[PDB]
Amino acid sequence: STTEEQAKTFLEKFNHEAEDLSYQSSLASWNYNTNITDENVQKMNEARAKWSAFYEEQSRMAKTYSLEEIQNLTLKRQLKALQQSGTSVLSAEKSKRLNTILNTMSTIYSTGKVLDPNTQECLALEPGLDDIMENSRDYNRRLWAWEGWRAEVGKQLRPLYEEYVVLENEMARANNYEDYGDYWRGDYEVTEAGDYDYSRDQLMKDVENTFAEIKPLYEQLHAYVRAKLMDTYPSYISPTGCLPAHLLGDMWGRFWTNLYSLTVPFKHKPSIDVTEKMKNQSWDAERIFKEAEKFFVSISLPHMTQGFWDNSMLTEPGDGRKVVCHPTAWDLGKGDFRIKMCTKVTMDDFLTAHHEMGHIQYDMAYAAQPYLLRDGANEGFHEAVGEIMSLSAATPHYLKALGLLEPDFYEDNETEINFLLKQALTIVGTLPFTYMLEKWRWMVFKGEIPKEQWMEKWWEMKREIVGVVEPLPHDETYCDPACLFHVAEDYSFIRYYTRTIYQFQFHEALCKTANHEGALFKCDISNSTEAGQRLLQMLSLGKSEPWTLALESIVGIKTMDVKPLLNYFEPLFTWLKEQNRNSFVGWSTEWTPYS
Amino acid sequence: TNLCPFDEVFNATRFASVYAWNRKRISNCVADYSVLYNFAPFFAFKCYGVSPTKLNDLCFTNVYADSFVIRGNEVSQIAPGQTGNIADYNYKLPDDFTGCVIAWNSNKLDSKVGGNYNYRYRLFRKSNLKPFERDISTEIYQAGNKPCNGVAGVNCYFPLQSYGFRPTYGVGHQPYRVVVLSFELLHAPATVCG
Numbered sequence: 001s002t003t004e005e006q007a008k009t010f011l012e013k014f015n016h017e018a019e020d021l022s023y024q025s026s027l028a029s030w031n032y033n034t035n036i037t038d039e040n041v042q043k044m045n046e047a048r049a050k051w052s053a054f055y056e057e058q059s060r061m062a063k064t065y066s067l068e069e070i071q072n073l074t075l076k077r078q079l080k081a082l083q084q085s086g087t088s089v090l091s092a093e094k095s096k097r098l099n100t101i102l103n104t105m106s107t108i109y110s111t112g113k114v115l116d117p118n119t120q121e122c123l124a125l126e127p128g129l130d131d132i133m134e135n136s137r138d139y140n141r142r143l144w145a146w147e148g149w150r151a152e153v154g155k156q157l158r159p160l161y162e163e164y165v166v167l168e169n170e171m172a173r174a175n176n177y178e179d180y181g182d183y184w185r186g187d188y189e190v191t192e193a194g195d196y197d198y199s200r201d202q203l204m205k206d207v208e209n210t211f212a213e214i215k216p217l218y219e220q221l222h223a224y225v226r227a228k229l230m231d232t233y234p235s236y237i238s239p240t241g242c243l244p245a246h247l248l249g250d251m252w253g254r255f256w257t258n259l260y261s262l263t264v265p266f267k268h269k270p271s272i273d274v275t276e277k278m279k280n281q282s283w284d285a286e287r288i289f290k291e292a293e294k295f296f297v298s299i300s301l302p303h304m305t306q307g308f309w310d311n312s313m314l315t316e317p318g319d320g321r322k323v324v325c326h327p328t329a330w331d332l333g334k335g336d337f338r339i340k341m342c343t344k345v346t347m348d349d350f351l352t353a354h355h356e357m358g359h360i361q362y363d364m365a366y367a368a369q370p371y372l373l374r375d376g377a378n379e380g381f382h383e384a385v386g387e388i389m390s391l392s393a394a395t396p397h398y399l400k401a402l403g404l405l406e407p408d409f410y411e412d413n414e415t416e417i418n419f420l421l422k423q424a425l426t427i428v429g430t431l432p433f434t435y436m437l438e439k440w441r442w443m444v445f446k447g448e449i450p451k452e453q454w455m456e457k458w459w460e461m462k463r464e465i466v467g468v469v470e471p472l473p474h475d476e477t478y479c480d481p482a483c484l485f486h487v488a489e490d491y492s493f494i495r496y497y498t499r500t501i502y503q504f505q506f507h508e509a510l511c512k513t514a515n516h517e518g519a520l521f522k523c524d525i526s527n528s529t530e531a532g533q534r535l536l537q538m539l540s541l542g543k544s545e546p547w548t549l550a551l552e553s554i555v556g557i558k559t560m561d562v563k564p565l566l567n568y569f570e571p572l573f574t575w576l577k578e579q580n581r582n583s584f585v586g587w588s589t590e591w592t593p594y595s
Numbered sequence: 596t597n598l599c600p601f602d603e604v605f606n607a608t609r610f611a612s613v614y615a616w617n618r619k620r621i622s623n624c625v626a627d628y629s630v631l632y633n634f635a636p637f638f639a640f641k642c643y644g645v646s647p648t649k650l651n652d653l654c655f656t657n658v659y660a661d662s663f664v665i666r667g668n669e670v671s672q673i674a675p676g677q678t679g680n681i682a683d684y685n686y687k688l689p690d691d692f693t694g695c696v697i698a699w700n701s702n703k704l705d706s707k708v709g710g711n712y713n714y715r716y717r718l719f720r721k722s723n724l725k726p727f728e729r730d731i732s733t734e735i736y737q738a739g740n741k742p743c744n745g746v747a748g749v750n751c752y753f754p755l756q757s758y759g760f761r762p763t764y765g766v767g768h769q770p771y772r773v774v775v776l777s778f779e780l781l782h783a784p785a786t787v788c789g
């Protein structure tokens with residue numbers, strides 16, 4: 001009879017059986033990542049085979065209801081997530097090869113080799129080819145390096161992408177959707193909650209407007225790098241033109257990080273870095289992970305359970321065991337929290353521990369909530385909470401109190417300007433790249449871009465938005481959107497644009513609450529209780545509330561604001577006015593090495 | 596002249612579940628409650644209506660002992676006036692309870708690599724419980740309007756769920772042993788006291 005009774009009882013059975021099997025899967029992965037043996041990796045298969053198989057029926061056995069006969073808001077959201085079937089609602093025979101094409105694409109990307117002239121010996125991307133990608137300043141070798149990768153792998157994947165788009169586009173029409181691009185846009189959609197409505201169509205509105213106010217910063221940043229890059233390559237960069245696409249410190253040009261040596265303003269005043277001073281007082285791995293608490297304990301955030309200190313790996317194994325050394329924060333569930341990292345004694349490792357510790361605190365705050373609503377508010381919230389912590393752990397005031405810096409240390413403005421440019425090359429020079437990649441990918445999925453104009457349309461927006469040109473044009477043989485990790489394994493990329501605008505909104509309120517005066521780039525939130533208790537409001541809601549409500553409580557604006565990202569770089573913006581007055585602003589798209 | 600009978604209720608190789616708990620009647624004995632502070636008065640010793648000190652010399656007609664194993668966060672429901680899965684369907688206490696509730700940690704005994712699947716509790720029941728009563732029932736729950744014919748399936752769930760207990764859990768899902776002592780006073784000679 002009543003839908004409320006059976007719907008409420010079904011989730012009680014699901015919310016408890018899920019915990020038993022979810023914990024089994026997570027621990028099986030932890031054992032494999034610490035013990036790589038043939039027998040141990042075998043045990044993983046069953047752990048993931050009794051969760052993927054288990055989730056299928058509960059998706060079918062929760063679709064036999066109807067949404068409009070539920071009046072509770074909290075209870076209704078748990079059903080909506082569980083009703084998503086994917087391709088399982090379609091026939092098994094027309095969607096059997098859709099899996100086969102997808103995993104085939106990733107196999108080719110993994111197996112890729114770029115040789116060298118005379119074929120003296122072979123090279124591979126990890127780590128050999130990446131090592132010499134932009135470590136040298138040989139233009140002719142740079143040209144070989146770029147087109148070599150584009151020719152080898154970009155040619156093979158072109159047939160295997162049109163079939164990928166066409167076959168899977170109809171899958172979106174099976175789940176009641178317009179285009180596949182809107183399916184990826186459904187993580188920022190909330191309905192039936194007054195004054196807190198967000199639509200898929202709206203996510204194109206704010207992103208276009210939020211980038212409209214970032215261009216003035218990017219406009220002047222391009223001029224500075226172009227002016228100083230002329231010294232290394234004086235024959236191939238005109239005073240007024242777009243940057244070449246193979247002088248950027250990456251195979252794809254995502255992060256402008258490997259350019260500090262060629263673009264350092266002051267070469268007489270070193271940037272602050274303490275690795276030897278830490279290497280003086282017989283510093284060990286445990287001490288690094290203990291001072292991480294004092295940042296969190298002295299801000300009123302909780303301690304960590306004793307299970308953190310015995311079951312977790314906080315150092316290299318030191319034995320014949322083979323493990324993966326990439327840092328990761330794990331949430332095995334049911335009160336078990338662990339951290340895995342190959343810790344060494346360096347300044348860069350000091351800040352990484354602060355980042356990884358921020359993830360654990362977010363998990364420790366919403367464990368009370370149901371299983372299906374135990375995650376961040378949206379895609380880019382987990383990597384925004386854990387990035388502001390490294391911002392208060394690299395300030396030259398916090399380190400002074402920690403005793404790792406001399407009490408008498410003057411803060412010259414040259415170091416401040418030198419420090420700000422390093423951050424701009426990482427978190428400011430990648431925003432147009434992500435927007436351009438996603439805007440093309442949304443349009444190519446919609447169907448507005450025709451068959452013959454795929455790759456021409458790729459470079460039409462490249463000149464206008466980011467401002468790079470290809471040395472040698474290609475017609476229909478090279479797929480540039482095939483050389484990336486995310487694009488070739490069916491992942492999203494808009495999580496990397498929101499988390500960069502979201503962190504600076506969080507940082508501008510946790511500092512104003514803490515009563516800090518001055519510029520924001522020397523802000524320490526340590527010893528503040530009012531600020532440290534405001535963060536415990538968003539962090540405990542999880543996915544119970546819409547992402548609009550979570551942001552409303554912390555900053556005071558229900559939308560995305562870009563002004564905080566322009567107050568973190570305000571001293572930098574003043575400097576570029578004087579150092580770019582005797583130069584040209586903007587870039588011309590018509591200029592190209594065609595002949 | 597005789598040792599206290601606090602040797603099987605408080606010291607057992609294996610305990611019982613909560614859906615089918617254990618009751619022991621203790622009477623006609625010289626029992627000293629000072630030993631209760633020597634084994635495990637660790638997590639909680641709360642009681643109401645009887646002072647935990649200077650009232651051990653009073654005489655009562657009967658003493659009741661109940662023992663079971665529940666979760667760490669579920670010990671807050673063993674009290675008059677609380678609600679929850681344990682309090683409303685497994686074990687309910689009267690509004691004017693007379694006795695002390697003792698809880699302590701037992702991780703080293705009720706934890707296994709695969710988990711102790713021998714501990715079970717009842718998840719949903721048709722109606723709430725009356726105080727001081729127990730139910731050991733294996734009958735399907737009719738969540739719908741269709742007869743189940745005694746076989747589970749759609750809208751037909753097994754009413755008892757397990758307690759997976761592993762040593763790597765937190766201090767919230769760790770196994771705990773709770774012994775509830777009930778003091779009764781009635782119209783009869785109070786033989787049991789010390």
Ligand SMILES: *[C@@H]1O[C@H](CO)[C@@H](O)[C@H](O)[C@H]1NC(C)=O
Nearest residue numbers: 031034035036037038040321
């Ligand atoms: C890891 O594997 C080795 C042998 O491969 C074994 O001796 C050791 O006990 C294992 N350690 C753990 C924690 O499983």
Ligand SMILES: *[C@@H]1O[C@H](CO)[C@@H](O)[C@H](O)[C@H]1NC(C)=O
Nearest residue numbers: 004008071072073074075076
């Ligand atoms: C919605 O569910 C919650 C569950 O905690 C309950 O307390 C509340 O009364 C429900 N709302 C309505 C209108 O029934």
Ligand SMILES: *[C@@H]1O[C@H](CO)[C@@H](O)[C@H](O)[C@H]1NC(C)=O
Nearest residue numbers: 276277278279280281282283
């Ligand atoms: C630490 O620095 C002091 C500075 O004088 C030095 O004397 C001492 O030897 C250093 N300790 C080391 C290098 O272990």
Ligand SMILES: *[C@@H]1O[C@H](CO)[C@@H](O)[C@H](O)[C@H]1NC(C)=O
Nearest residue numbers: 411412413414415417575578
């Ligand atoms: C940095 O040094 C002092 C700071 O008080 C100031 O006079 C000077 O103009 C600043 N800028 C430069 C480029 O020296």
Ligand SMILES: *[C@@H]1O[C@H](CO)[C@@H](O)[C@H](O)[C@H]1NC(C)=O
Nearest residue numbers: 294295298401402526527528
């Ligand atoms: C301020 O921080 C320092 C270093 O963490 C600490 O020793 C001191 O007690 C703090 N003061 C207050 C008032 O919290």
Ligand SMILES: [Zn+2]
Nearest residue numbers: 080081082084
């Ligand atoms: Zn879901």
